[PDB]
Design a protein around this ligand. Structure first.
Ligand code: MG
Ligand code: ZN
Length: 288
């Protein structure tokens, strides 16, 4: 019995990629967001969209579109799962400087976390009685920033955590998935995750260990990464962790495909998606 379908998650990554790059303000972004909403609703979630016009670092006005999907919306004890769904507009880390003005698929950076969570949604919609409320949030406009400028990233999570869909929203725990699909990925303890949610990072990494995934979930320090979980911690006080492919042994910390033309379907590994999905589902089931 396989609780998390790696084949299905892989297909959700490919679906997103086949729309074209999900660049804020563009037609593939609108079409893919439409499909993400319809698909979450077909898996039994109550889905609402949170929209706003946000100013990006270069002055572009972006039509931000956060996607919020809920199971058992009346329950007071809730678990929060997160991923960003936009694609950075340019592969400005490509090894070929001529590519820094071009677009790329965002298969891992964007596709992988959404794909894993769509498959978890499919699983949740089949349960006959959830033991807690569950929210799945896909943040927009995470990846439109500038490297010297931390506030220029994670615009959708900053907006949502300051203006959530219920007043004073609380979840007991929050898990962010970012770049969880590439062959050879290494999930170390991200610093802010460990500093603010030691119990959660311990429970998740220990669950992965018990499932046989200690070759992916490494019990050692990783990077201090500003990501969508940090605004949630700071503004909502929810202990959140980030599961993210990162190692200080990597040239750019992130995997070698990050913000290059090689972040495309050929670097995606079903076994990495499975390790992450099976760990998350097991942890969720053991909370109830
Ligand atoms: Mg599986
Ligand atoms: Zn990125």
């Amino acid at each position: 019995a396989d609780l998390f379908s790696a084949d299905s998650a892989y297909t959700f990554v490919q679906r997103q990629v086949n729309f074209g790059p999900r660049i804020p303000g563009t037609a593939p972004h609108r079409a893919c967001g439409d499909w993400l909403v319809a698909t979450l609703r077909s898996f039994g979630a109550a889905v609402q969209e949170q929209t706003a016009e946000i100013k990006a670092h270069d002055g572009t006005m972006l039509p931000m579109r956060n996607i919020i999907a809920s199971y058992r919306p009346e329950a007071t004890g809730r678990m929060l799962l997160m991923a960003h769904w936009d694609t950075r507009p340019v592969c400005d880390q490509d090894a070929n400087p001529a590519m820094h003005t071009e677009t790329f698929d965002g298969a891992d950076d964007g596709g992988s976390g959404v794909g894993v969570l769509l498959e978890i949604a499919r699983y949740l919609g089949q349960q006959k009685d959830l033991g807690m409320g569950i929210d799945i949030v896909f943040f927009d406009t995470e990846d439109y920033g500038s490297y010297g400028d931390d506030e220029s990233w994670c615009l959708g999570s900053q907006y949502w955590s300051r203006n959530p869909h219920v007043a004073g929203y609380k979840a007991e725990a929050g898990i962010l998935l970012d770049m969880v699909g590439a062959k050879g990925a290494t999930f170390y303890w991200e610093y802010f995750s460990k500093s603010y949610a030691p119990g959660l990072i311990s429970a998740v990494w220990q669950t992965a260990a018990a499932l046989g995934y200690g070759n992916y979930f490494i019990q050692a320090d990783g990077g201090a990464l500003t990501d969508d979980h940090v605004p949630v911690i700071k503004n909502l006080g929810i202990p959140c962790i980030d599961i993210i492919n990162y190692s200080s042994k990597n040239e750019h910390g992130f995997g070698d495909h990050w913000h290059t033309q090689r972040d495309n379907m050929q670097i995606i590994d079903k076994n990495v998606l499975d390790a992450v999905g099976e760990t998350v589902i097991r942890y969720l089931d053991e909370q109830v």
